[PDB]
Structure formats: C-alpha cells, structure tokens
Swiss-Prot record:
Involved in several stages of intracellular trafficking. Interacts with membranes containing phosphatidylinositol 3-phosphate (PtdIns(3P)) or phosphatidylinositol 3,4-bisphosphate (PtdIns(3,4)P2). Acts in part as component of the retromer membrane-deforming SNX-BAR subcomplex. The SNX-BAR retromer mediates retrograde transport of cargo proteins from endosomes to the trans-Golgi network (TGN) and is involved in endosome-to-plasma membrane transport for cargo protein recycling. Belongs to the sorting nexin family. Residues 1-142 form the PX domain. This is Sorting nexin-5. The chain holds residues 29 to 170 of 404 of the full protein.
Length: 162
C-alpha cells in the first residue's frame, strides 16, 4: 500500500501513444499522496536504461522494459477499409469496422498492461521502489511542455499539461 501505480487511461494518436500514470502513495517524500502524469513509451525506456546502468543495483533482477506500442496492423487495416466504403453491403463495412476496433482494443489492452506491469514490478521491489529516478518518473510535471503559435500579429502561448 506504500506505493500503488496504475495506468487508468491511454491515448493512441497517429505517431504516438500517451499513457496516464497514476500514483497513490504514503511516502512523505512526494509532494502529494496522489497524482497523475502523462508519459510516453520513451520515458519508460529512459527509466529502464537508468536502472540498468546504476552500479548499486548490480546483481539485482531489474524488471524487463515494456514492449514498444505497435498499432500498425490496425491502422493499416483502417486505411484499407475506408477504400471499400463504396464496395460492400451496408452491414459488411459495419462488421468490418467492429473487427478493426476489436483489434485496436486488443492492442491497447496489451500495451497498457505491459507498461503498467513494469511500473508495478518496480513498486513491489524492496530496493528499486526507492529509486530516485523512479520517483521523478512518477511525479515530475514538466515533461510535456507544449507551445502554441497563433496568428491573429503572432502570439505564443505556453501550455502546461503534467
């Protein structure tokens, strides 16, 4: 109960998957006992690389890194189906669309679980759960600074999304 992590939601975009990493904790070192941050697969790879290279963890079993999210099969089949929009019986597209969405969903389930299990294994570990880089991964809120540039005369707006 000292450190509970889950991934309540994820966003699949064209070239990206974003995970919401949600932490409940009683550790006094954190700013808040419960918080959420947005992380991408590469942030998980950075964390795993960092653990792997820490001299003090030599001989400890470090949980495997999560597998890269691959939505290519579903998206390619989505693109192909849009072509037969004029080539089927008003049901067949519908049935084709449902199968495509099941395939998306099956990918989502697998990739969220892989990324989630990785964090949960770290949280279970008597030594690794104390790792400072692991703590930064969970609570640092400046990882996704985005700027909007708009022409009304041009104005640039900072957009802050933890």
């Amino acid at each position: 109960p000292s450190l509970q992590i889950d991934i309540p939601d994820a966003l699949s975009e064209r070239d990206k998957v974003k995970f919401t990493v949600h932490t409940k904790t009683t550790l006094p070192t954190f700013q808040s006992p419960e918080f959420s941050v947005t992380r991408q697969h590469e942030d998980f790879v950075w964390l795993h690389d960092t653990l792997i290279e820490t001299t003090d963890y030599a001989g400890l079993i470090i949980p495997p890194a999560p597998t890269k999210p691959d939505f290519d099969g579903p998206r390619e089949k989505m693109q192909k189906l849009g072509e037969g929009e004029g080539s089927m019986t008003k049901e067949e597209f519908a049935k084709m669309k449902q199968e495509l969405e099941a395939e998306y969903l099956a990918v989502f389930k697998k990739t969220v679980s892989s990324h989630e299990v990785f964090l949960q294994r770290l949280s279970s570990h008597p030594v690794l759960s104390k790792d400072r880089n692991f703590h930064v991964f969970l609570e640092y809120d400046q990882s996704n600074v985005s700027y909007k540039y708009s022409k009304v005369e041009w104005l640039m707006e900072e957009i802050q999304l933890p």
